[model samples]
Target: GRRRRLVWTPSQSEALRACFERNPYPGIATRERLAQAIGIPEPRVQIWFQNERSRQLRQHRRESRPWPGRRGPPEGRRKRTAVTGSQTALLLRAFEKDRFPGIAAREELARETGLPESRIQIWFQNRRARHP
Candidate 1:
């Protein structure tokens, strides 16, 4: 016997990956739910999320940089359209339900809706600041 690292099996890895894809930044309750699903410790789930978040951010940074001669659009330019009715509906529903939906919920909604998490967070922040 020797000191060793804890490893997740293939099924566990798949479950974790599926869950992460569904919600990259799971909150405490979602982590607890994941931990129970895969027989892992809550702290382990937290660590997994932290590590995966860093990985995702790193990957995003790598992919987002302008590659040589691969121009897409001008910097600081945004599409000249309002957020869609569907998106606004989802945002309004979540805002009304939780006032501050947890990290996982936000991430899941973003993933499902093909919107950015920053947009969701900013919308919530602006609402809180102005939605008396």
Candidate 2:
């Protein structure tokens, strides 16, 4: 025989399918056992397992809905709010003390000024950019 293809018996295929149902990804030891039981080469068994797994994955994806085009977080810009004169004065004082304040300092500033920590951080960024 020249360029002969390996044909699988019904019983052998049934056994392989049953094993796949148990675990899609089988170890080398499992594959060796399966090959011996099915009377096929270990490499052939390994190839069949790979093909079956790929086929199942493709079938599953085909049944499911297509993924969204965008990957990251949704963009919904919040409305900008102006800082009060008192709040500005406090922020300026804090800025003079330490231009690059840590999380604790920023939280303390946020509580004193009754503003969001994010806003405080942005104010510091703007001040640093303008002054620098």
**Please, what is the whole-model Cα lDDT of each candidate in the order they appear?**
0.72, 0.80
Candidate 1: segments with Cα more than 4 A from true spot: 1-4, 65-132
Stretches of candidate 2 exceeding 4 Å from the true structure: 1-3, 65-132
In Å, residue 63's CA in model 1 sits off its true spot by 1.3
lDDT of 1 by residue, 38-57 (tens): 99776577778789878777
Q: Model 1 lDDT vs. the true structure? A: 0.72
Q: Which window of ten consecutive residues has the lowest lDDT sum in model 2?
A: 67-76
How would you encode candidate 2's per-residue C-alpha lDDT over 64-104 as one tens digit per residue?
84533334543343347689999999999999999999878
